Point group: D2
Chain length 351, copies 4
């Protein structure tokens, strides 16, 4: 009956929702946090027993790094987790193009290091292991929609690194009988999403424009199409995969496709502005119909050298085997994110 989770990447979007979910289920939750010159725990600070004194209760934190083999062994050996969720990563696709080696060492080799730490600790038989796989693996998609058996075609050093991680997880599963699974999750956003992913960038910018604190912002490829769900729904799927009798990989997604362009339009609609588009390519601009003011421009610096044009997930296997369903759909996702960021910018024009 002992339920002890270890979350790498606990400070990120998904880790903070997953920590809450597992705490709610009575888990003792351990996380690995990077040393940083300022604290990086803002998403999970409310999960201290005393947030004012930063005293831990059932969520306990450990300094560590996915590139330091010894610290991972020490932490796993001390914690003896029953479930490990490897969410730690350099997770940004655009940044990965000029941080390609660091991204490989953390996202790819770092997964190996965590798996070898489990094995070193004698826990291959005692641990269930979740790997944060990603729809970026499909890249230039080879099937539509994409399912567990769709061949991968990565399009960034991030995708390539996660492809390494995916297969080394399969190899520990097959070679050593580790209960280890690849959650092949499609894009998921929330009010806690990193600020330079495209959805949170739009909702942040629309909020600042609404409050008169920003006039305009620049985007990259407006025509990219994504399957977007809500991170809070998706972390439950991660836990469900570790409850399955057999270790299996699952696609987690909504199966509904929308463009970056639509996210922009729906976001502005919630602050009472109708965006109309002018021009083409890097000279395209989005203008408020009601005021005539230009609020969106295009800057090639936000483009990727090898774009991922289209993603649409088929989560049939998860729905059948895990009884999982997405709760939040695209329209509600956009409203929630814009409203959250409006309330945030009201408190702090520098947020």
């Amino acid at each position: 009956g002992r339920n002890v989770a270890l979350i790498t990447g606990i400070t990120g979007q998904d880790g903070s929702y997953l920590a809450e979910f597992l705490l709610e289920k009575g888990y003792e939750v351990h996380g690995i946090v990077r040393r940083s010159s300022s604290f990086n725990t803002g998403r999970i600070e409310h999960l201290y027993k005393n947030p004012q004194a930063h005293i831990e209760g059932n969520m306990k934190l450990h300094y560590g790094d996915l590139t330091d083999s010894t610290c991972l062994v020490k932490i796993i050996n001390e914690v003896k987790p029953t479930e490990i969720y490897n969410l730690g990563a350099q997770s940004h696709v655009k940044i990965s193009f000029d941080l390609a080696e660091y991204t490989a060492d953390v996202d790819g080799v770092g997964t190996l290091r965590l798996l070898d730490a489990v094995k070193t600790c004698g826990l291959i038989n005692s641990v269930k292991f979740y790997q944060a796989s990603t729809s970026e693996l499909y890249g230039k998609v080879q099937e539509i929609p994409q399912k567990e058996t769709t061949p991968f075609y990565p399009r960034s050093p991030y995708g390539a690194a996660k492809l390494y991680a995916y297969w080394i997880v399969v190899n520990f599963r097959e070679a050593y009988n580790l209960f280890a699974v690849n959650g092949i999750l499609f894009n998921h956003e929330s009010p806690r999403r990193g600020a330079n992913f495209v959805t949170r960038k739009i909702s942040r910018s629309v909020a600042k424009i609404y409050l008169g604190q920003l006039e305009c912002f620049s985007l990259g490829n407006l025509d990219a199409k994504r399957d977007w769900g809500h991170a809070k729904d998706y972390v439950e799927a991660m836990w469900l995969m570790l409850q399955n009798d057999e270790p299996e990989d699952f696609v987690i997604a909504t199966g509904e496709v929308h463009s970056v362009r639509e996210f922009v339009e729906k976001s502005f609609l919630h602050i009472g502005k109708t965006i109309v588009w002018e021009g083409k390519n890097e000279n395209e601009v989005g203008r408020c119909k009601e005021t005539g003011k230009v609020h969106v421009t295009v800057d090639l610096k936000y483009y990727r050298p090898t774009e991922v044009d289209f993603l649409q997930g088929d989560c049939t296997k998860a729905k059948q085997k895990l009884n999982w369903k997405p709760r939040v759909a695209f329209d509600e996702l956009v409203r929630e994110m814009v409203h959250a960021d409006v309330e945030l910018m009201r408190t702090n024009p520098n947020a």
Copy 2:
């Protein structure tokens, strides 16, 4: 791109305590200031966001940031090649001594090999004769001190994975200077603090905890070795010394310090006096506690988890050489530093009890 009158700095570790003060110092001298920032799942630029041209939109002016990491050789070459700096300040590091004992390999890779990676990037870009290089060395190099006080010629005796990694960095910097005639210097800076100090260094831990106790947000906090003695100065004074070392006619290494020693115990006592509380110590070793004389409440305890397996008992810097050659003088003394940090953290905690 290089010409006389064009001053372009590249700061690794720009988001840290020193990097934030040094960015301000160089900006006000009219430098174009570039910084390398780690990718982070939330933003880590809190110390320098006020240096955006537009802090509401986070639009850059004369401070320009770049994603990178000292463990990624290619990214360092790309950034240096793009920026073509005249001055490079390598402040980026896993800088915490206690954490380094259980993060030993990461600390070696960043603080030791990362210095070589940055030096090697300068050479790869063909800029050996175009850049001046500042290395963030440290009084932790003296460790178990072989002389008192410590100066440039005092032999090093490191006492942590942090100290060993910074020792590698110190000497690989000397080697690039001697082998390739790079203008590269080691600033051997003794401890320096500020209201921007990391929260888990001992000074900021005390001022934060005293501030929270003052405000009823905390009743008691634990320290480690109360008897450690340190040479403590102010980070804003010390970043000025980094710049002066790069203005020197020849590349020399310099100790930078106050020369005045105080114990952790004394920092605790002075901090509590600023909120009107006198601490009286009872007990010994891990059972020692500090009690408020006026109220009888125990506010300080000792926890062995904050000890270090190999402590650095005593540090005292002799900066005679820098006083003579750089005309550098510390401005903030220990008493003022304590007052400034307690006062700043009282304000912080009153505004945000979760800070």
Copy 3:
């Protein structure tokens, strides 16, 4: 025009044949050699201009390592090759299970290091890059036979590392227009093959048994089936891929399949011994009919945790587009290897 080749892995089996092949065409051939406590250039010492003094002519060696980014940039900037062959790797599958992280750093991240070095030197439009990809990418084969479009399924830390390299190569090709190709070569052997690969282990042991220097040796999985060609034929295909008008990936193979058991049988037949099998699984032994002497046993320490049971390559594409044709078939490969090792072992019983 200029023909300047840089070969990583020049001391290995393939590098030694490729160096000879390019030298014959008038290339200046540079190689990267690891620092070793003894010399590791035995396969290429005959290509010094003066072998007694080890003075170089048109083959020029450079100390380096695929894990040292700065050293790779210095070498590429000095050599400015027109053609790069990334053959350097920890290439042994069984050893990769105990050396998983080193294998990842050299075979996967090391390929990224070499590509980034090309880019750092400004040579992205000035060099043609060959990557030593491998039939091990197919692992648990998803199609029979296997061709360029067969979905991958790696089965070792080696396979996973090479799959990262495969895809980071594609990404540099697609992102920066680097002329980069994956040669998907199936198993290829020679008298220069590493001694602990299965074919050379057999030819070496048969040679020692013929000379009375050995009585018996042990293998692992006798039922494994492989597509085996000759390394000298296959390095020609590498060069042809870089002569192609456009950067394409190519399978290189014979399309014929034999078992490890069959390799044993044919090798022993060349020293006039008929191997007859008796027993099953780990107790199976091979006995010489003529003499009744046991010469082959099974030791499970040579098994792999996730075996690759069957490989068979379809090189239709390379035959049509490159006019490549293997000239050495399985039976001639066996004769040649046993013949060469008999001569070697006669000269030196400790070889």
Copy 4:
């Protein structure tokens, strides 16, 4: 009983002599060997129980690398050594200048990895650890002669990396009470010395000239001065340091200084030739007085950008506490190395 040694760097000069030394004392001796495309065990292949079959007796080898933490932990857990000698290193000073990062990773961080592996394996209080420190730490010497209290002043990426390793060993000793020692050994040579160190380079070249297999060879800085002893004497001091009651660091040296130029002159005298020098700097040549033929030239490519001009060790502490004393002196070392290489080159002009 129980005497189980683990030697990293067992294939090198010192590891080969140390293996024999420990085997004679009845140790079970384990080595870590790097995977290489051809075998790298030539110095130790006579220590197989059956050297023709390469079957192990009391010397047992394990594939590994000082940059792969997991493999280090696995080997130490399996072997459970009582004594660990960390001799593995990129040990060449000139190569370290353009292989600076790899040399840091192996010689510096690799030492921490091996120490951390000892700690991870729970052997911090049972194993005795020998670190292969070096007189290169003294670099630009601050005292003559150099002893334990002489301050370090490294002059290469090799020296800096070894200086990190020196102090991290001290830190594990002081922090965790690990019995760990630094052997501060001055230069030591033998007929097994790496061919591109200056002494073996000379004896190889003089031997070839004696056999009419070579006419001339080039050197670097002829006036460098060194304390040279015999590796076979020095490995005994390593063992003695781990027999000491308390873990202490020791200088090991002969206290006698000779120049590279003297090594040349004495080596040629052993083949009946008197070298007379003419010219300066890179134009200096060494001519046989009896014949007038030039046999030695200077090439700046063998210079180092930061030379270590002079080394002379004072091993008073070791003589008093360990009772160690060198047996082979400079004249005997020169004659031994020339004679061995004459016998070697007789067998093979391409050796």
